[PDB]
Amino acid sequence: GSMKIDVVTIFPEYLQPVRQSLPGKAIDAGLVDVAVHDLRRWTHDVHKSVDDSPYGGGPGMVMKPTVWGDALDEICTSETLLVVPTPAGYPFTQETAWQWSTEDHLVIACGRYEGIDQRVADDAATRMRVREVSIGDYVLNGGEAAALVIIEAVLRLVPGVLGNASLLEGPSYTRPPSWRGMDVPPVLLSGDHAKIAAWRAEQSRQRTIERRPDLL
Amino acid sequence: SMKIDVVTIFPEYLQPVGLVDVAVHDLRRWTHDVHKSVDDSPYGGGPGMVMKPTVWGDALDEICTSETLLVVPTPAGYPFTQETAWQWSTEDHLVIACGRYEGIDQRVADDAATRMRVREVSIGDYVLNGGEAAALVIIEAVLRLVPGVSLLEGPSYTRPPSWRGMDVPPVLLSGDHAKIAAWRAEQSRQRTIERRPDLLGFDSP
Numbered sequence A: 001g002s003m004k005i006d007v008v009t010i011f012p013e014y015l016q017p018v019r020q021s022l023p024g025k026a027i028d029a030g031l032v033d034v035a036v037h038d039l040r041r042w043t044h045d046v047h048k049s050v051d052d053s054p055y056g057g058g059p060g061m062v063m064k065p066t067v068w069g070d071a072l073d074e075i076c077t078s079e080t081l082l083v084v085p086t087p088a089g090y091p092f093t094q095e096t097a098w099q100w101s102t103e104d105h106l107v108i109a110c111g112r113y114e115g116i117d118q119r120v121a122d123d124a125a126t127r128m129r130v131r132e133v134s135i136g137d138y139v140l141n142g143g144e145a146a147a148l149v150i151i152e153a154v155l156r157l158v159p160g161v162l163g164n165a166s167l168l169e170g171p172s173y174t175r176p177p178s179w180r181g182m183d184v185p186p187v188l189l190s191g192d193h194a195k196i197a198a199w200r201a202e203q204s205r206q207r208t209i210e211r212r213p214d215l216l
Numbered sequence B: 001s002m003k004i005d006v007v008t009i010f011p012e013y014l015q016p017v018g019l020v021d022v023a024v025h026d027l028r029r030w031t032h033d034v035h036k037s038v039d040d041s042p043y044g045g046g047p048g049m050v051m052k053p054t055v056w057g058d059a060l061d062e063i064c065t066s067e068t069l070l071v072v073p074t075p076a077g078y079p080f081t082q083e084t085a086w087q088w089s090t091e092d093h094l095v096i097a098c099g100r101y102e103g104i105d106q107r108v109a110d111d112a113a114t115r116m117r118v119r120e121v122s123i124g125d126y127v128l129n130g131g132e133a134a135a136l137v138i139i140e141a142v143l144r145l146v147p148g149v150s151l152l153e154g155p156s157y158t159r160p161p162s163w164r165g166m167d168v169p170p171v172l173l174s175g176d177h178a179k180i181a182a183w184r185a186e187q188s189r190q191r192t193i194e195r196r197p198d199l200l201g202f203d204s205p
């Protein structure tokens, strides 16, 4: 019913859409609080360094464990579920979203560059629950867009937070009944509601075969 | 060179975005009525609402050409994958139609498909409240591939070599390129079996 989400990122402005997506009613009811933190608050040096070269060589850079360690020490508690987006993560699915929707405290650690030194998650996992997850089979530049997806998918399952109320869903239609030469399937206007449900089931079967045969 | 037009009833949500131009359009600009209505109840019943085809048709008429790739996020879409991102990275013009409510009248995509290429896609197996976050994901994955810009990655490390009593794997400090390459390959394949066995052709957990 109530959840705190802390997001840590070197691009705090990226997370502005979700703070805007929150209805005042939910905030006022104390049902939800989303806070965004600039990782550079926890840097050690005048240059506010968050990255360094990879051990073993290779392209790109790795985010520093000492900076992240300090950030997570301050923000996390023993009750925290630490969420770490990564293209190498376990798949984030609707099952995940449902599970996380009843958590009291999510912390989302958004990486950039080539990711975060693995000891950050490994150390954190010795005192809290840690979940390395991926939102899909494509590569992003960092975790912020993944955080937006995760926050939306989770919070829409928490009663009253975002203001909203297997096989693939089939097509939907509304007025007008005819538009640019295309008519709404007459069965939908038939008043035969058992037949409509059967029609929708077959549309779902066809669409699932065409687009996601793996689900069958 | 690529142009991306995004159409949405929440242009503010697209704020997180010279070889590429991204323009964001408020769908309600193409309404005529005072209440600027973009949604109506579904034919055949069901919870929620459906976006009207009329408003969308007018918006897309103005923004699209026959050369346009029309992208429509939907939980019922074909999977958007890295292959898709590579394919779209060489397009001149993407238009991303972001829905809300329970989605968009199917005739919008069907009508558009008579004039241009249309792709209904899903970014993953979870449900969002609308297409805007999916648009941000798609734009990021595509733009990083535009000219002039398998297996799971194993763990990465940087300085210091010992932290909180946790050591960087000694092989990575050894300077032995062959041993490091081998270790990284093993770590990758080990992570893949554990987290995404489907990528190697095994059953999902």
Ligand SMILES: N#Cc1c(-c2ccc3ccn(Cc4ccccn4)c3c2)n[nH]c1N
Pocket (backbone or CB within 6 Å): A085, A086, A087, A089, A110, A111, A112, A113, A114, A115, A116, A133, A134, A135, A136, A137, A138, A139, A140, A141, A142, A143, A144, A146, B153
């Ligand atoms: N979830 C998720 C993700 C991400 C993601 C998440 C976090 C980071 C932090 C840095 N990068 C860039 C990067 C590029 C190459 C290799 C490693 N890392 C991220 C990418 N990409 N695709 C997903 N489904």
Ligand SMILES: N#Cc1c(-c2ccc3ccn(Cc4ccccn4)c3c2)n[nH]c1N
Pocket (backbone or CB within 6 Å): B073, B074, B075, B077, B098, B099, B100, B101, B102, B103, B104, B121, B122, B123, B124, B125, B126, B127, B128, B129, B130, B131, B132, B134
């Ligand atoms: N890509 C992608 C998506 C979406 C997505 C995309 C566009 C819309 C427009 C409205 N909704 C809400 C909604 C809820 C229930 C049934 C239908 N529609 C969207 C959801 N959800 N999950 C994905 N991987």
